[PDB]
mmCIF file of C-alpha atoms and ligand atoms in Angstrom:
data_model
loop_
_atom_site.group_PDB
_atom_site.id
_atom_site.type_symbol
_atom_site.label_atom_id
_atom_site.label_comp_id
_atom_site.label_asym_id
_atom_site.label_seq_id
_atom_site.Cartn_x
_atom_site.Cartn_y
_atom_site.Cartn_z
ATOM 1 C CA UNK A 1 9.507 -42.591 -17.712
ATOM 2 C CA UNK A 2 6.592 -42.031 -19.108
ATOM 3 C CA UNK A 3 4.210 -43.485 -16.479
ATOM 4 C CA UNK A 4 3.645 -40.516 -14.111
ATOM 5 C CA UNK A 5 2.934 -36.806 -13.813
ATOM 6 C CA UNK A 6 4.984 -34.825 -16.451
ATOM 7 C CA UNK A 7 4.140 -31.235 -16.790
ATOM 8 C CA UNK A 8 6.354 -28.303 -18.575
ATOM 9 C CA UNK A 9 9.451 -28.949 -20.032
ATOM 10 C CA UNK A 10 9.073 -32.421 -18.286
ATOM 11 C CA UNK A 11 6.062 -33.482 -20.890
ATOM 12 C CA UNK A 12 7.827 -32.039 -23.870
ATOM 13 C CA UNK A 13 10.599 -34.033 -22.833
ATOM 14 C CA UNK A 14 8.844 -37.099 -23.144
ATOM 15 C CA UNK A 15 7.033 -36.315 -26.192
ATOM 16 C CA UNK A 16 10.318 -35.678 -27.937
ATOM 17 C CA UNK A 17 11.915 -39.453 -26.439
ATOM 18 C CA UNK A 18 8.862 -41.205 -27.189
ATOM 19 C CA UNK A 19 7.792 -39.588 -30.804
ATOM 20 C CA UNK A 20 11.757 -39.033 -31.802
ATOM 21 C CA UNK A 21 11.268 -38.180 -35.667
ATOM 22 C CA UNK A 22 7.873 -38.065 -35.735
ATOM 23 C CA UNK A 23 8.173 -35.066 -33.944
ATOM 24 C CA UNK A 24 4.921 -33.733 -32.150
ATOM 25 C CA UNK A 25 2.652 -31.573 -31.579
ATOM 26 C CA UNK A 26 2.293 -29.840 -27.622
ATOM 27 C CA UNK A 27 -0.724 -27.657 -27.355
ATOM 28 C CA UNK A 28 -1.513 -26.967 -23.479
ATOM 29 C CA UNK A 29 -3.530 -24.977 -21.526
ATOM 30 C CA UNK B 1 -5.657 -32.048 -23.694
ATOM 31 C CA UNK B 2 -2.218 -33.143 -23.233
ATOM 32 C CA UNK B 3 -2.139 -31.443 -19.658
ATOM 33 C CA UNK B 4 -5.463 -33.133 -18.210
ATOM 34 C CA UNK B 5 -4.134 -35.936 -19.181
ATOM 35 C CA UNK B 6 -0.456 -36.237 -18.060
ATOM 36 C CA UNK B 7 0.804 -33.553 -16.688
ATOM 37 C CA UNK B 8 -2.785 -33.393 -13.434
ATOM 38 C CA UNK B 9 -2.781 -36.817 -14.173
ATOM 39 C CA UNK B 10 -0.863 -39.585 -14.862
ATOM 40 C CA UNK B 11 0.471 -39.706 -18.468
ATOM 41 C CA UNK B 12 0.654 -43.178 -20.523
ATOM 42 C CA UNK B 13 2.845 -44.226 -23.833
ATOM 43 C CA UNK B 14 -0.276 -44.817 -25.138
ATOM 44 C CA UNK B 15 -2.015 -41.419 -24.611
ATOM 45 C CA UNK B 16 1.605 -39.612 -25.670
ATOM 46 C CA UNK B 17 1.645 -41.399 -28.857
ATOM 47 C CA UNK B 18 -1.508 -39.536 -30.100
ATOM 48 C CA UNK B 19 0.159 -36.473 -30.005
ATOM 49 C CA UNK B 20 3.151 -37.550 -32.471
ATOM 50 C CA UNK B 21 3.025 -36.380 -35.878
ATOM 51 C CA UNK C 1 19.711 -18.985 -25.720
ATOM 52 C CA UNK C 2 17.924 -19.081 -29.208
ATOM 53 C CA UNK C 3 20.810 -17.519 -31.067
ATOM 54 C CA UNK C 4 22.980 -20.959 -31.427
ATOM 55 C CA UNK C 5 22.880 -23.829 -32.730
ATOM 56 C CA UNK C 6 19.750 -25.953 -31.277
ATOM 57 C CA UNK C 7 19.204 -29.400 -31.978
ATOM 58 C CA UNK C 8 17.336 -32.213 -30.349
ATOM 59 C CA UNK C 9 16.266 -31.690 -26.709
ATOM 60 C CA UNK C 10 18.422 -28.406 -26.912
ATOM 61 C CA UNK C 11 15.747 -27.270 -29.944
ATOM 62 C CA UNK C 12 12.674 -28.744 -27.884
ATOM 63 C CA UNK C 13 13.542 -26.730 -25.052
ATOM 64 C CA UNK C 14 13.841 -23.274 -26.603
ATOM 65 C CA UNK C 15 10.344 -23.884 -28.325
ATOM 66 C CA UNK C 16 8.743 -24.450 -24.767
ATOM 67 C CA UNK C 17 10.612 -21.287 -23.346
ATOM 68 C CA UNK C 18 9.596 -18.910 -26.314
ATOM 69 C CA UNK C 19 6.017 -20.248 -27.248
ATOM 70 C CA UNK C 20 5.136 -20.528 -23.488
ATOM 71 C CA UNK C 21 0.880 -21.322 -23.266
ATOM 72 C CA UNK C 22 0.834 -21.125 -27.087
ATOM 73 C CA UNK C 23 2.566 -24.701 -27.657
ATOM 74 C CA UNK C 24 4.465 -25.276 -30.409
ATOM 75 C CA UNK C 25 4.951 -28.218 -33.054
ATOM 76 C CA UNK C 26 8.386 -29.812 -33.563
ATOM 77 C CA UNK C 27 8.711 -31.296 -37.252
ATOM 78 C CA UNK C 28 12.079 -32.860 -37.851
ATOM 79 C CA UNK C 29 14.144 -34.334 -40.347
ATOM 80 C CA UNK D 1 12.518 -27.429 -41.474
ATOM 81 C CA UNK D 2 13.054 -26.086 -38.024
ATOM 82 C CA UNK D 3 16.510 -28.932 -38.161
ATOM 83 C CA UNK D 4 17.651 -26.997 -41.214
ATOM 84 C CA UNK D 5 17.215 -23.189 -39.924
ATOM 85 C CA UNK D 6 17.751 -24.154 -35.911
ATOM 86 C CA UNK D 7 20.092 -27.405 -35.994
ATOM 87 C CA UNK D 8 22.203 -27.234 -38.654
ATOM 88 C CA UNK D 9 22.425 -23.513 -38.910
ATOM 89 C CA UNK D 10 21.890 -20.679 -36.470
ATOM 90 C CA UNK D 11 18.621 -20.540 -34.830
ATOM 91 C CA UNK D 12 16.835 -17.113 -34.322
ATOM 92 C CA UNK D 13 13.616 -16.187 -32.418
ATOM 93 C CA UNK D 14 11.936 -15.143 -35.678
ATOM 94 C CA UNK D 15 11.845 -18.538 -36.868
ATOM 95 C CA UNK D 16 11.633 -20.137 -33.465
ATOM 96 C CA UNK D 17 8.024 -18.323 -33.155
ATOM 97 C CA UNK D 18 6.679 -19.465 -36.513
ATOM 98 C CA UNK D 19 6.344 -23.147 -35.181
ATOM 99 C CA UNK D 20 4.445 -21.873 -32.034
ATOM 100 C CA UNK D 21 0.685 -22.653 -31.901
HETATM 101 NA NA1 NA E 1 13.338 -44.627 -25.045
HETATM 102 NA NA1 NA E 2 11.857 -16.295 -21.183
#
């Protein structure tokens, strides 16, 4: 699911799934 | 940033994990 | 959509929608 | 943290915006 173009909610979802209990930061534009 | 690497270009696990805390 | 219990992907989604171009940080547990 | 305030208790816009950059 990670090896594609991921934008918007799709990208946030991938971060959520990959990072798990670590959490993540999303900083766009 | 992440948009340039994962949205307008193809994302990778390698790149995504750089944004995990 | 914000005034409820929000867990996991549901919480990430709310952050995404509320924060917009600002982005956000998700730090759980 | 955010889980305590928004997942195991009811979330609020006020609380969510504290996690925007
Ligand atoms: Na997985
Ligand atoms: Na909205």
